[PDB]
Amino acid sequence: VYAWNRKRISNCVADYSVLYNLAPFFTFKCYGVSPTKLNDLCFTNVYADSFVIRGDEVRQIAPGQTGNIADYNYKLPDDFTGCVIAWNSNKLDSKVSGNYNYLYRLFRKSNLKPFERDISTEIYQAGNKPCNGVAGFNCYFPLRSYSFRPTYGVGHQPYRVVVLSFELLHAPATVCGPKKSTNLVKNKCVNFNFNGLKGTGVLTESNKKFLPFQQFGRDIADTTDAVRDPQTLEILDITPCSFGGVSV
């Protein structure tokens, strides 16, 4: 948690549906946005911070909290617009004799600034004698090791945390979703959408040849007349069903 890892995400389509369908990820406390609703949204960058904490400490991973974790290890800002996912890691994180592979910063002269990382190990001088780099009276090493054990109590059993931040920059959004997009019919008017365009028409087959990059079609009178089918690249037509006034 003191040396929390940060994976930056870019240029992909995230099937949030994938983790949103797994009970192991029980703690899905998210602030600033709804998960169902953001699967139809796009951000420039996404950041994935992960680390392992004890069982009841999951609460500190939330905006405006205090404690060893939030003050010295992983602080979220007051104005946080992402999610926190946490699940028990009694799978392999714990060992019979204990895994000396986890540390939590215990002392630090100052609370973190949000999303700040501190991996520097310099004795915490609490007295007024310099410590010179050896632990002793009023001279404390910064980190300590969690005694993860299989029989440990739930509040002290293992726990992984994944923290999703979403940012919006003037840069084009490199992150989106698949949005369950496959359907095609012919010779019947349908509220058809092809990657963003709308309309209704009897979409048939065209003898007309696009160029490989060209997407839409037009006439002398700024009317859409052909849409290349994105999945099976073919030239369609567009014609709304018959209209015209009736006359008695």
Epitope: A3, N5, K7, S50, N101
Partner: antibody, heavy 127, light 111 residues
């Protein structure tokens, strides 16, 4: 070309600290699990510590457990090894090696294959 | 906490013949995938060591086709199809399964 440069050597008395640093240059530093391997003077090699692709340590040697502390930084492409309770029996060369299999390229994640080795430092302890 | 041994402890080889070295373990390294995790490394004297074989028998990159690796269970062997003047030094076998990792005492090959 791939370069692994380490620094931090020098005579230090017993009962102090040191901070060895290994810097990598020439590859995507976040798809390779680093390792720190000692080399006693005129003896065989001996694994010391390691770190996976996600900054998650993979345990230390049985006789060294308790003092050494590894840390990584993908932003600066830097791996560091804080050393505590230095004793006379800790004098040796120290190489920082890199794994071979890039992660998710094929069961589990890879950790074997120390292929590229920098020229180690010459840490020593005496009074 | 796995202890490995090598044999022979030290053998003299002459340029133009094959040689065979055996590494033995305590617990068979057959993983669930079916792969042995033992690795063979050559530490040339006066120079940093270099990789020879990874994943039991999959030949490493950039080394010539004169080396062969075989074995399974708790016994593995490395055979130099043809030995030459540039194959002298120390050889080690290192586990890649139950952490911490371990390195054999080392075989000393000379002329």
């Amino acid at each position: 070309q791939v370069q692994l440069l380490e620094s931090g050597g020098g005579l230090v008395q017993p009962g102090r600290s040191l901070r060895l640093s290994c810097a990598a240059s020439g590859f995507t530093f976040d798809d390779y699990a680093m390792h720190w391997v000692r080399q006693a003077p005129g003896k065989g090699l001996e694994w010391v510590s390691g770190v996976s692709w996600n900054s998650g340590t993979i345990g230390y040697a049985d006789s060294v457990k308790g003092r050494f502390t590894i840390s990584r930084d993908n932003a600066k492409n830097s791996l560091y090894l804080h050393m505590r309770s230095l004793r006379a029996e800790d004098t040796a060369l120290y190489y920082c090696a890199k794994a071979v299999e890039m992660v998710r390229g094929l069961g589990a994640d890879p950790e074997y294959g120390m292929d590229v080795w920098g020229q180690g430092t010459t840490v020593t302890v005496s009074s | 906490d796995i202890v490995m041994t090598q044999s022979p402890l030290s053998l003299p080889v002459t340029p133009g013949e094959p040689a065979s070295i055996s590494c033995r373990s305590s617990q068979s390294l057959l993983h669930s995938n079916g792969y042995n995790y033992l690795d063979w490394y050559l530490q040339k004297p006066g120079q940093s060591p270099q990789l020879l074989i990874y994943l039991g028998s999959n030949r490493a990159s950039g080394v010539p086709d004169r080396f062969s690796g075989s074995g399974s269970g708790t016994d593995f062997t490395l055979k130099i199809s043809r030995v030459e003047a540039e194959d002298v030094g120390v050889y080690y076998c290192m586990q890649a399964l139950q952490t911490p990792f371990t390195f054999g005492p080392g075989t000393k090959v000379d002329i």
